[PDB]
């Protein structure tokens, strides 16, 4: 039915309006530029990073916008309920920042199933994944009390593992050997470079938005900046290394350059030192390039898990490097946090993502949301009016 998506979107919007009317009431202006940088990241960088597909740019950017717009509201509601324990709560800049963080997690999960899902499935996945992510984040922040100010474990690894879990459940045999529409274009890769550059530039604000003002926020900014700087060089070097005749791969340049920002999040506020941050970025870039070169084909062909954007090598493996760095940092005195609490936070994030992903994918597996056929995957014509000319 063609009326399923508008009806579900209207019902969800009405539910959001009712919840805001029932539970939502009215440092802000100091952190507002950081919130704006995070907002630009979430809506432009992630939106256009997935526009590398030649026949799926419209769907990628539009579903990114719609998913993030629903996600900020639903994440605001769920996070405010969790923090207020069911009571009314006020809205500040931090609520909006955490809403953008929830939208980031949902977009990271969406990057795994790009080109194989319908907008209705994306609305349902956003609704379920926000609840799972917010519960996991509340667990990590309050019960474990671990330091994840950049959210390498609670956002990146969680969204990556939740997305892989939906993608394995939604796995299609016809797409394991490849697809004709699953291909990049010159201008599509240029738009992907727009998104990559925006994410890369505004990542320090992403890692320092909710940091404690003073030493911790500046440490997060500096560590993210230099980690990204080292990550770009290592990603370029290993992209040249793993390809024939030293050719640079556009996927590697578009994705692996953000691995340093992903993996420095846990140790952002910690006093690792700029050198410690540049060592993590150099490794995160190496791991991301090696993942894109080798692990993504092994996952697609052998594990029946297909990652369209390779969000695993960008968020999960760098997220596990980020969680692992934080345990090592506590061991080395960077943070007064507990090593066992950090390990428990990483394990809980991974486990909750995989349990939430499998159950969201089981819900999405029902043939009720207008899922595209195998021949029509990675095509804008399924849901959009495509212009005749490119």
């Amino acid at each position: 039915m063609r009326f399923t998506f508008p009806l579900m979107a209207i019902v969800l919007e009405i539910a959001m309006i009712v919840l805001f009317g029932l539970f939502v009431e009215y440092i802000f202006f100091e952190l507002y530029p950081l919130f704006q940088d995070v907002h630009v990241m979430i809506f432009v960088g992630f939106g256009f990073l997935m526009t590398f597909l030649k026949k799926y740019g419209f769907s990628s950017v539009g579903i990114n916008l719609l998913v993030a717009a629903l996600g900020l509201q639903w994440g605001t509601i769920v996070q405010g309920i969790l923090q207020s324990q069911g009571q009314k709560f006020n809205i500040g800049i931090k609520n909006m920042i955490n809403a953008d963080f929830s939208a980031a997690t949902v977009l990271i999960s969406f990057g795994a199933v790009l080109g194989k899902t319908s907008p209705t499935q994306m609305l349902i996945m956003t609704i379920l994944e926000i609840v799972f992510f917010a519960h996991n984040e509340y667990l990590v922040s309050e019960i474990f009390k671990a330091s994840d100010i950049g959210a390498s474990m609670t956002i990146h690894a969680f969204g990556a593992y939740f997305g892989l879990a939906v993608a394995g459940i939604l796995y299609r045999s016809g797409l394991r050997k490849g697809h004709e529409n699953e291909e990049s274009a010159y201008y599509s890769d240029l738009f992907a470079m727009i998104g990559t550059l925006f994410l890369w530039m505004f990542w320090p604000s992403f890692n320092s938005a909710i940091a404690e003002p003073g030493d911790k926020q500046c440490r997060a900014i500096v560590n993210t900046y230099f980690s990204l700087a080292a990550c770009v060089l290592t990603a370029f070097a290993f992209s040249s290394l793993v390809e024939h005749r030293g050719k640079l791969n556009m996927v590697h340049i578009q994705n692996a350059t953000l691995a340093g920002g992903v993996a420095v999040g846990t140790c952002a506020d910690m006093a690792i030192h700029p050198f410690g941050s540049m060592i993590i970025g150099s490794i995160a870039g190496m791991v991301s390039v090696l993942g894109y070169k080798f692990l993504t084909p092994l996952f697609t062909t052998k594990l029946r898990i297909h990652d369209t954007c390779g969000v695993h090598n960008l968020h999960g493996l760098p997220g596990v490097v980020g969680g692992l760095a934080g345990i090592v940092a506590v061991a080395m005195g960077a943070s007064n946090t507990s090593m066992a609490m950090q390990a428990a936070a990483l394990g809980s994030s991974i486990g909750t993502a995989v349990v939430g992903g499998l159950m969201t994918g089981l819900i999405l597996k029902l043939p009720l949301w207008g899922q595209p056929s195998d021949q029509n995957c990675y095509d804008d014509s399924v849901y959009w009016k495509v212009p005749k000319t490119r």
């Binding site: 919007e13 309006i17 419209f58 629903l70 509201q73 014509s381 959009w384 495509v386």
Partner: protein, 380 residues
């Protein structure tokens, strides 16, 4: 009539250089210079400039062969409009002291003209756009001065009607033009522009508020209403379409429906659920207009005008809660509409003059008229 464009090697450079020299002379004769929050005050104006250039230049770049002209002419119109609006707002609110706040106000005045130009882009050249910029800035300043003199309001605070003024001015100018399409990459560039406009529209919803509390509430309301409007617009694009698909061009205009609806009353809204309701109503009204207005030239500009009128109406509704007040507000709205229509008619009459060397009706929406391309026969 010859369809080949006339040479503008002597009209456009002379016109632009004369305008720039006049602006420099007026700035020399009538402008003068002049802490803790210098960067904070500059950030709002920077957001307005980012919107006015990027979003308003790429949003109209969705045309298949008219993206170059859209972007570059938007930049040129912004650059001229800010400079002329500084002088006009200094003249009509009095020398002119140049501050960041005055730059912000001139940026809003130029944004009005940039919004208006979206209904006429693809059918006019640069000189006609210069004439439209000058006349529209002058008309908006005159409207603000008349409102301040009659209703005892502030000249800088009369800039809230700029949505409806820009929309009706653009429609009126497009109506007077002679009577006369999409590609994937221009559509993606327009999506980038629309995304930037949608993200930074809370800045343009509270540049005129002085107290921090009102600005914070306005930004909250604009953010939530814009999110609701985006969800509703992306949802309902399939309903208002014969092909039962989502129209990217419709989304580009309807992402901003909630921000337009709550723009005039974002500080009066006491709770975000009311802003979300207004955004949902704005999205549904956008769907209805997209499904009905083409039946009864620019559809996006028409639905923008309808959204601006709806925002004014909901401001009227909300102002009573927080007889003669309604009459004053309705008279101000009617005066704004009448002045916008009259100025649009005057600008359209001036734009039909043969001296501007307007492009032929068969050469509309083409960058070949105004831009150099290789391997082309030039001249006779």
């Amino acid at each position: 009539s010859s369809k080949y464009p006339r040479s503008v090697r002597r009209c456009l450079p002379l016109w632009a250089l004369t305008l720039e020299a006049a602006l420099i002379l007026l700035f020399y004769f009538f402008t003068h210079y002049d802490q803790k929050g210098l960067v904070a005050s500059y950030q709002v104006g920077q957001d307005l400039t980012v919107m006015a250039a990027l979003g308003l230049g790429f949003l109209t770049s969705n045309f298949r062969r008219h993206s170059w002209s859209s972007v570059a002419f938007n930049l040129f119109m912004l650059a001229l409009g800010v400079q002329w609006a500084i002088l006009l707002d200094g003249f009509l609110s009095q020398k002119v002291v140049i501050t960041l706040f005055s730059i912000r106000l001139a940026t809003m005045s130029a944004m009005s003209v940039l919004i208006s130009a979206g209904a006429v882009l693809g059918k006019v050249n640069l000189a006609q756009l210069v004439v439209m910029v000058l006349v529209e800035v002058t008309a908006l300043g005159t409207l603000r001065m008349v409102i301040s003199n009659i209703f005892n309001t502030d000249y800088h605070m009369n800039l809230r009607h700029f949505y409806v003024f820009a929309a009706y001015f653009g429609l009126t100018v497009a109506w007077c033009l002679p009577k006369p399409q999409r590609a994937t990459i221009p559509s993606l560039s327009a999506m980038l522009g629309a995304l930037f406009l949608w993200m930074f529209w809370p800045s343009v919803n509270s540049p005129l508020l002085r107290s921090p509390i009102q600005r914070k509430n306005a930004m909250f309301n604009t953010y939530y209403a814009l999110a609701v409007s985006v969800v509703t617009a992306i949802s309902g694009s399939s309903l208002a379409h014969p092909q039962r698909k989502i129209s990217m061009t419709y989304v580009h205009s309807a992402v901003l429906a909630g921000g337009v609806a709550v723009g005039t009353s974002c500080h009066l809204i006491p709770s975000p659920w009311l802003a979300m309701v207004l955004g949902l109503v704005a999205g549904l009204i956008s769907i209805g207009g997209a499904k009905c207005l083409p039946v009864c030239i620019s559809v996006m500009h028409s639905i923008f005008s309808l959204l601006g009128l709806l925002g004014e109406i909901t401001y009227i509704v909300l102002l009573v809660l927080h007889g003669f007040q309604v009459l004053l507000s309705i008279g101000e709205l009617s005066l704004a509409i009448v002045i916008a229509l009259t100025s649009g008619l005057l600008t359209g009459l001036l734009l039909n003059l043969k001296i501007w060397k307007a492009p032929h009706v068969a050469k509309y929406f083409d960058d070949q008229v105004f831009w150099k391309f290789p391997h082309l026969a030039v001249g006779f």
